[PDB]
Amino acid sequence: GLSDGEWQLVLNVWGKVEADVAGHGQEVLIRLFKGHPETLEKFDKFKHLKSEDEMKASEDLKKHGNTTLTALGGILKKKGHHEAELTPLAQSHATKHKIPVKYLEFISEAIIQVLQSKHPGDFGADAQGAMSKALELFRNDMAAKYKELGFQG
């Protein structure tokens, strides 16, 4: 929904995530949890984390971080042709995890925050702008799958 150009800035920055997915994945969930604490309530498994040093030590938070950026990297690589990889995610988060679309915006922002903190040198005006559109698209598609499953928020 981006230009080929934009898809290439997105894949280019995504390669840096791929050189360390668990580490980017843990900072994302931590950024998300310190930023919108209400998001931590959706995670039965992590509700016990009382502070960042506890979040930081959690081996399962870290694996979950891996799992989450791994699924987001398989969607991104599809450059927009992702219905098949999206669907499953829209189903689980929609019916089993009960995740509002609002929270998707929160994790989109955590994800940008983390690239900006980790790769300033390579996360310039252009890469920022392509990555935002790509997350915005992922969100709008997730929003629409929801709507069609008869969900909404």
Ligand code: HEM
């Ligand atoms: C970047 C967008 C996201 C992606 C790619 C993603 C991906 C995943 C994946 C791959 C799993 C494991 C399998 C499954 O249930 O489908 C999962 C589980 C889960 N997701 Fe996400 N997710 C995203 C955003 C969110 C957000 C924003 C929340 C809550 C605010 C959330 C809450 C959960 C929960 C509570 C689980 C179950 C974890 C467990 O206790 O084992 N997800 N997600």
